[PDB]
């Protein structure tokens, strides 16, 4: 219905705003673009489903997220990929892990404070009806 499409458009506006605030944070620069094989050759060996903040923006605009839960699954994938690719005690690994945990925590904290629970419930109920 037209009212349901208005609901999903508001969700997209919200998700673009959250994603933009993550992408401009200097701590999260490493998560802003897809990993380039020429700069990180062994990445494809470890990471089966790559994800980054530019890919998240593309998915918003392709109407792939109908709930904030679906969006947070991709934020969580950005973080879990970073933890999997950076498991060692070396400081380069530990720095990326710290930033990945901060990305996850920051996204969840923004959503917990700024997303109305009834709005998310409406999105989920529309999704379950389709
Ligand atoms: C995001 C990620 O998992 C990632 N991990 C690294 N780990 C390392 O360099 C070594 C120290 N474990 S570099 C890196 C990365 C990826 C894209 C751009 C960029 O500037 C950095
Ligand atoms: C989208 C969702 O299912 C969701 N997941 C959370 N994760 C947690 O509580 C744990 C995993 N940190 S908080 C949260 C949430 C946040 C705001 C409004 C709302 O209705 C739900």
Curated annotation (Swiss-Prot):
Disulfide-bonded cysteines: none
Induction behaviour: Up-regulated in breast, uterus, colon, ovary, and stomach tumors. Induced in breast cancer cells overexpressing NCOA3 or treated with estrogen. Down-regulated in 5-fluorouracil-resistant derivatives of the colon cancer cell line HCT 116.
Domain Bromo, chain residue ranges per copy: 3-114
Chain coiled-coil ranges: 108-130
Subcellular location: Nucleus
Tissue: Highly expressed in estrogen receptor positive breast tumors and in osteosarcoma tumors.
Superkingdom of the source species: Eukaryota
Function noted in UniProt: May be a transcriptional coactivator of the nuclear receptor ESR1 required to induce the expression of a subset of estradiol target genes, such as CCND1, MYC and E2F1. May play a role in the recruitment or occupancy of CREBBP at some ESR1 target gene promoters. May be required for histone hyperacetylation. Involved in the estrogen-induced cell proliferation and cell cycle progression of breast cancer cells.
Protein family (similarity comment): Belongs to the AAA ATPase family.
Subunit record text: Interacts with ESR1 and NCOA3 and these interactions are enhanced by estradiol. Interacts with acetylated lysine residues on histone H1.4, H2A, H2B and H3 (in vitro).
Name by which UniProt lists this protein: ATPase family AAA domain-containing protein 2
Native source species: Homo sapiens (Human)
Top-level taxonomy: Eukaryota, Metazoa, Chordata, Craniata, Vertebrata
Gene name, Swiss-Prot/TrEMBL: ATAD2
Shown residues within the full chain: 981 to 1108 of 1390
